[PDB]
Amino acid sequence: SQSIIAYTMSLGAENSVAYSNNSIAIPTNFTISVTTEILP
Amino acid sequence: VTLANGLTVLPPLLTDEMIAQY
Numbered sequence A: 001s002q003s004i005i006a007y008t009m010s011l012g013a014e015n016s017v018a019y020s021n022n023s024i025a026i027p028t029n030f031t032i033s034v035t036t037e038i039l040p
Numbered sequence B: 001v002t003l004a005n006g007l008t009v010l011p012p013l014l015t016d017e018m019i020a021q022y
């Protein structure tokens, strides 16, 4: 069964980050990615 | 902030609650 549906807004994915005293994160590897920007 | 024949005021897509959450 397929039809029109109505849903509330997807505000986005929920990300859990934990602020901690004296704790740090540093990236180990890295990734290189190219993105398209279009200006008329 | 103090707010304010065929003329209808369309509500914004982004509600105040979702803007505050952003």
Ligand SMILES: *[C@@H]1O[C@H](CO)[C@@H](O)[C@H](O)[C@H]1NC(C)=O
Pocket (backbone or CB within 6 Å): A029, A030, A031
């Ligand atoms: C970094 O990522 C690449 C893939 O993008 C992977 O091939 C490479 O092994 C990674 N480097 C390390 C040290 O894991």
